[PDB]
RNA sequence: UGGCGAGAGACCGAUAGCGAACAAGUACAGUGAUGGAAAGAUGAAAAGAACUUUGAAAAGAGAGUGAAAAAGUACGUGAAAUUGUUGAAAGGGAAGGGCAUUUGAUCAGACGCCAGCAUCAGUUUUGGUGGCAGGAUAAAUCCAUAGGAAUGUAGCUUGCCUCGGUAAGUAUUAUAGCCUGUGGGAAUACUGCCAGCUGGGACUGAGGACUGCGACGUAAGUCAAGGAUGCUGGCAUAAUGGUUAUAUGCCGCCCGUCUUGAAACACGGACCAAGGAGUCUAACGUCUAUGCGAGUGUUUGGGUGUAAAACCCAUACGCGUAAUGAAAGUGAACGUAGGUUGGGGCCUCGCAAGAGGUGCACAAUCGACCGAUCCUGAUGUCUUCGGAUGGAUUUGAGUAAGAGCAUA
RNA sequence: CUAUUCUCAAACUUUAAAUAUGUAAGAAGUCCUUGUUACUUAAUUGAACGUGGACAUUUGAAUGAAGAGCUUUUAGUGGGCCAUUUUUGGUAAGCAGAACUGGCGAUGCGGGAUGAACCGAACGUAGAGUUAAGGUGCCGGAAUACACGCUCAUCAGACACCA
RNA sequence: CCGAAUGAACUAGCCCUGAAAAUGGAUGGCGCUCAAGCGUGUUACCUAUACUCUACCGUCAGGGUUGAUAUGAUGCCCUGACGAGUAGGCAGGCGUGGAGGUCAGUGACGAAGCCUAGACCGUAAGGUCGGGUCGAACGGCCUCUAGUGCAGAUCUUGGUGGUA
RNA sequence: AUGAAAGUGUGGCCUAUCGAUCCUUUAGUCCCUCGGAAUUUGAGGCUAGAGGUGCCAGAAAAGUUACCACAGGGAUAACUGG
RNA sequence: UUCUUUGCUCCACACAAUAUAGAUGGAUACGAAUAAGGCGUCCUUGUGGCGUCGCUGAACCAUAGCAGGCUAGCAACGGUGCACUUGGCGGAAAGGCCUUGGGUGCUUGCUGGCGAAUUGCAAUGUCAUUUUGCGUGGGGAUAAAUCAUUUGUAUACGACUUAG
């Protein structure tokens, strides 16, 4: 019985979201549903971003929306987005869409609404497009959270120091300039 | 499937998988005969076999 | 962390909590400074046991009080170590333990217990027989035939001589046989196959309406076909079973620890009860949950209150929303916020295979933008200031449609 | 000096293994045209990257694939020891020190009587069947089995590591 | 003279010499001599926690399914593989002192405690019940919290032994 | 620099010949700072060296104990045993 | 061993126990050799002639009947129990071997005549051998030791040797 990997080793993903919110183990039933019954490959991406926890569910903007509509052919499509919609006061111009959210922002909801849009679940999501008939599934990007500069720092990485105070006297004297020992 | 019944006895699942089970069976093809009157020995191959 | 007077508690509950719940800084030790215990509970009420009898007496056995004396001032409950008696059991230089059953005691399941047989399914052991395959289409044996020899068959011959006896040579089958060649038919072994047939045995019976795949028959139906049913008996309780003690076969070094290595002639451990060792905090890394989200955080404080609660709230402030330089400083769009190879998902044509389009995250890569460093050095001008403009195998914990703040 | 001769080399060598070891065996591929460039060229030649076409049944060896890739964080550990083979020091060692692998540590179980390391096999709880190493006189489950030899010891011999 | 095999020189098998240590002594013991020794061959045979089949436990993986279809979607169910372990990690639970909520919970017709070669449940931590003693409180469940579980520390205090 | 040139040359034909922070000192540069605002000394900075740590990733350091002590160690000696 | 009678023993019965190293036809008698014998036969009685036998006890003997009933006989003059007598022989652990006559039972040597069911299709389907005290009714016999005292051939104490 020479094992060739790691007997009863998990599969190592989510099954079920660590939340024990209600309303989204209700979405999750939903989705859980759709997902084996439908056979469209929309609804498979939708249960697993329902598991996906804070981290990795960022906030997708309005004018990151903005921009995922101002594609050629993918002006009508209803947005997905597994997480929060937040609000940009960057952008100006905000089209007539229909937007899919677990979440949205007071400033967000705002935006959507008087462009003359509409603010969708995913239950009402998946009352009007059983397969995500005409969707667009965004994330928010996971590699800008403030943790992520300083994974897998040291030489010559250029990498964040893990540290409280910023100035001059904190990691900058030896080993970050070749006048003082060495540079990295 | 709750057993696997054995193929080789039973005779049902014999027959169920090879329908041939039948024929073979029925024709008795495990005893073919089937010969001769040729009859071809040698000629040196036994000389250089006894030597 | 003092003194006096009050309210409190997700605190401690007599080895705890203060050293002190008690005549506790008491008893007691030391010359002295100082050291410093143990010790709460009968019952509602003493109703604290009148009176009788044994004994010198303490006390005993009665009687009584009591709701209880299995509450007697040795006092609620009264564990274990340890001991007495009774009851039961075992015992040839320990005992204790494991698996299995016998025996004795014992005890729930009152609604089942224990079997025998038949025909089947899964598994598997042990026969008995049948049909084939191949080899040097076995070799052999066997039959025919050719030649030959010896451990020389019958005869032949010479010797001893009982004339029917033996040695020796002769001779190739005769009054026996043998080997080697060639030829001719087979047969059995060895090995193999059979979707051939038939006995003997054991362990298992999981599952639980149907659905499947087959076979069988002219067929309807039947079947050993996707897991055991049918018939019969005895018993209905300590009979099976469990618990327990004991006996018996075999096995079993004493745990904890440091150690390459512990049964160790290495350390701790006589025994028992109770207490007895990863805590809280300030500040933080990761991951996760929750809220809100370009913001976030009410609670230092104010207002309020059914009063340390809850509820409400202004101005700040912390962190984030901008980086880089030692610093004076300067400070993020040529382009669809870039091009390229990938890329889930979605859109189009289609039956589908697929092709084409759009491509978030993320990954690599080439660029662009900000600060620094090295130059370049325009219009100008307080004539030494200003630093446009464009480069550099240089550099940064940067920009490039924000992710963070607060709490757990 | 010449031609012969005997025997040698961790720090000699012409020659030169075995075992280990690098790389390749294709879509990021091949072929045919053509585009910029401040690099290079005598050049209209190149070089790097492309545009546009063309070849997917054999997608360009075998076998496997238990999912493949990616990241964060943090425990213990940092005395080790043993065995066949290669091997250094040493008369040597149950000695000291290396190489590859396998083991013990951290491992029970069957066997070598006993044993950390040897052999066989790695372990949920049971039933049945079959075997490994090892054995089958008696202890002791299992032939006082069969077969050909050898040996007689007033110190027989008897199972690898191993006495 | 006699009357049918010899003469060396070697080679290796099993024995024998070489072969001496202290308690009595070990092919494991007994014993074994055409073996129960040594060499070799052939079958049969015995048995591991290994291998095959089957059951049940658990873990992991892939699936199906409340579709009006009431009884649990964190549920039920299908299929397949797997199971050693110090240091160590993680998960699921068992138990204790308190806390909020609930069962209009139990209780002087007997709470809790203790004793029990009686019973039942649980792989287990443990839980539940019967009998006795006893006499005033205590529990299930959903959550909060911690001075929360002992055999070892020549541990602490108290008590007890064998020696006797 | 050399050479007619191709070219070769960023020390020794190649494999060794060497040294952090802090401190001091030097070279660079019409540089920045000395924070109420000026100038010149003065000090401090920025970029590259040097003064050195041979225990060579870099403490600042002599004995003695037979009067001795504590935590340990069979990781390790003095006796047996193997 | 008592006379309080009722206690001790040996034999017979019934009874209430108590077990089982493990009945389930029979432990069936030369010695000696094994490169030699056994048994039968003969008679110049020997270490003798002539047969025969072995090659397993798979033998031999027992071997029928309600787990063995009740009955009519025929044939034998037998076999075999239960109790009794005769002479004996056995001392290694002889506790058993013979051996008389008798008796009384049975006989499957052979013909008969009834009976058996229902233990329901198996359930050991109970039948052996001990340790026995328990009442019956018969035979028989009618003690010692220890302590206390004493001695010193002995003596730590027990014990030993004495004495009454």
């Given at each position: 019985i020479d094992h060739t990997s790691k007997q009863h080793?998990?599969?190592?993903?989510?099954?079920?979201?660590?939340?024990?919110?209600v309303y989204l183990k209700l979405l999750v039933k939903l989705y859980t549903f759709l997902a084996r019954r439908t056979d469209a490959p929309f609804n498979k991406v939708v249960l697993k971003a329902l598991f996906l926890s804070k981290i990795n569910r960022p906030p997708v903007s309005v004018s990151r929306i903005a921009r995922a509509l101002k594609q050629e052919g993918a002006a009508n499509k209803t947005v997905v987005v597994v997480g929060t919609v937040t609000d940009d006061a960057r952008i100006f111009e905000f089209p007539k869409t229909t937007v899919a959210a677990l979440r949205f922002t007071a400033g967000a909801r705002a935006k959507i609404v008087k462009a003359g849009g509409e603010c969708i679940t995913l239950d009402q999501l998946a009352v009007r497009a059983?397969?995500?008939?005409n969707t667009l599934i965004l994330r928010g990007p996971r590699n800008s959270r403030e943790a992520v500069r300083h994974f897998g720092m040291g030489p010559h990485k250029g990498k964040a120091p893990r540290i409280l105070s910023t100035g001059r006297k904190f990691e900058r004297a030896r080993g970050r300039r070749r006048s003082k020992g060495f540079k990295v | 499937h709750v057993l696997k019944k054995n193929?080789?006895?039973?005779?049902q699942v014999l027959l169920r998988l090879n329908p041939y089970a039948k024929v073979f069976a029925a024709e008795k093809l495990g005893s073919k005969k089937a010969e001769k009157t040729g009859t071809k020995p040698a000629a040196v191959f036994t000389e250089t076999l006894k030597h």
């Open positions: 080793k998990r599969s190592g993903h989510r099954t079920a979201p660590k939340s024990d919110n059983p397969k995500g008939q | 193929p080789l006895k039973n005779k």
